[PDB]
Design a protein around this ligand. Structure first.
Ligand SMILES: OC[C@H]1O[C@@H](O)[C@H](O)[C@@H](O)[C@@H]1O
Length: 470
């Protein structure tokens, strides 16, 4: 409880509560502007929300069959996956995991990244003995901003989620990987570049036709959904006749860039601080305050400012806490996950990891802080779901969700659901909820394979997969 915390700290906890609490009226405010930005991003003039086409113009039926490869570039490790779509409305996947070398996510020699992915593919080929012969369709899940005018293209906009490699931005990633595959004479062809949220949208629809959206609450945030071609104004008169107006089209929103103008989001001085000190300030406004990548950075700055104010961690060595992005989301997650009255797990963390001693009330505050920024992250993140469900007329449906924060972060699922009930105003038992958030399918694995299948079928039918002349 709080029945033994000094008045100095209780007054700070009350202010932190007031700034990190987002009521239902504010959520509804954010959502309305969110909807405008979604529409604006579909016009030629554009907007801060990219609204990138995914070039998937069909719903998976289940009758899809074949052997498709699918790689997934995460920040921690590369994931090669073989997917046998049986057509029984399920799949059989043989996968591998290849750890990323130390400085890889940050390497100055970009050729090492592609060289790594290609070599890892060859190992998977020899271990699965599938190095005889058709050309294996490959689905490449590249979950970073990348505009695409056709499905087998991905021009890197900017690195996120801890990635920083020199000469890849503004470049098509696909040929980089493709002509590395061909140097090793591997029987692979990149048939599709897919965003993790889109692969998720499709993998889940494949096994749940009630899937209205595929969202990621992970080290990054993003959401994909099926729109209709006619709604996408910017593609007006840039498409072939095999892509009609009533046609479905998976949209990769890339809405982590929402409100870069800063006109609705309840940013605080700590939020502004995180932004100003981040690699590229003025970017990812929405993402910076809901994303797993930044949640710990928030905690770090609040702790630092409360210290440089003679209120907390007095006469302690904050030498280790001074390093930016030293705290990832595991810290808030583990602090909130502390089962002990005296918060003994938390104590151990600041001692072993940062070499700083805390009193009991100091951990009482740290803990309540992790609750506030985590609950706000949830309540704000679901504003993208309500916005999409309302721009389209989705009265009911399932939202396929994945991500390390959705999955691992304590009480996040509950918070995201309550945040969603507050926005709509729903009252009673949660089973009555017309729209619910459900655990997603394998988006980067199964999903990408299901998209390679849908893509090869169009190639075979001679039909297009991008804008004319792309
Ligand atoms: O990983 C989830 C999301 O992370 C964001 O940082 C990227 O821009 C998106 O492409 C991705 O969908």
């Amino acid at each position: 409880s709080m029945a033994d915390v000094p008045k100095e700290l209780m007054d700070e906890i009350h202010q932190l509560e007031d700034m990190f609490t987002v009521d239902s009226e504010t959520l509804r405010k954010v959502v309305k502007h969110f909807i405008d930005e979604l529409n604006k991003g579909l016009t030629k003039k554009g907007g801060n929300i990219p609204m990138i086409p995914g070039w998937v113009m069909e719903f998976p039926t289940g009758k899809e069959s074949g052997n498709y490869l699918a790689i997934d570039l995460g920040g921690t490790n590369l994931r090669v996956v073989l997917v046998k779509l049986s057509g029984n409305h399920t799949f059989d996947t043989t996968q591998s995991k290849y750890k990323l070398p130390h400085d890889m996510r940050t390497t100055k020699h970009q050729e090492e990244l592609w060289s790594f992915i290609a070599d890892s593919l060859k190992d998977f080929m020899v271990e699965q003995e599938l190095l005889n012969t058709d050309t294996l369709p490959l689905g490449f899940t590249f979950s970073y901003p990348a505009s695409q005018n056709k499905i087998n293209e991905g021009i890197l906009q900017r690195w996120t989620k801890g990635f920083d490699i020199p000469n890849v931005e503004g470049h098509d990633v696909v040929p980089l990987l493709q002509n590395e595959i061909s140097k090793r004479e591997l029987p692979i062809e990149i048939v599709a570049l897919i965003n993790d949220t889109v692969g998720t949208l499709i993998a889940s629809y494949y096994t749940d036709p009630e899937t209205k959206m595929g969202v990621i609450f992970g080290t990054g945030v993003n959401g994909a959904f099926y729109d209709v071609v006619s709604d996408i104004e910017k593609l007006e008169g840039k498409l072939a006749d095999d892509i009609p107006s009533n046609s479905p089209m998976a949209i990769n929103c890339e809405y982590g860039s929402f409100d870069n103008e800063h006109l609705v989001l309840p940013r605080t001085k700590y939020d502004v601080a995180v932004d100003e000190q981040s690699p590229r300030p003025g970017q990812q406004a929405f993402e910076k305050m809901t994303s797993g990548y930044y949640l710990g950075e928030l905690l770090r700055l609040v702790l630092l400012e409360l210290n440089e104010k003679g209120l907390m961690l007095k006469d302690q060595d904050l030498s280790k806490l001074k390093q930016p992005y030293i705290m990832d989301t595991s810290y808030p997650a583990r602090i909130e996950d502390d089962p002990f009255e005296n918060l003994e797990d938390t104590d151990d963390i600041f001692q072993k990891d940062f070499g700083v001693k805390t009193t009991l009330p100091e951990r009482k505050l740290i803990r309540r802080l992790c609750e506030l920024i985590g609950t706000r992250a949830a309540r704000l993140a679901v504003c993208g779901i309500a916005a999409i469900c309302q721009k389209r007329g989705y009265k009911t449906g399932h939202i396929a969700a994945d991500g390390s924060v959705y999955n691992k972060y304590p009480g996040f699922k509950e918070a995201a659901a309550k945040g969603l009930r507050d926005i709509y105003g729903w009252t009673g038992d949660a089973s009555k909820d017309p729209i619910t958030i459900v655990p997603a399918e394998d988006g980067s694995g199964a999903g990408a394979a299901v998209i390679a299948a849908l893509s090869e079928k169009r190639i075979a039918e001679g039909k297009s997969l991008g804008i004319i002349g792309a």
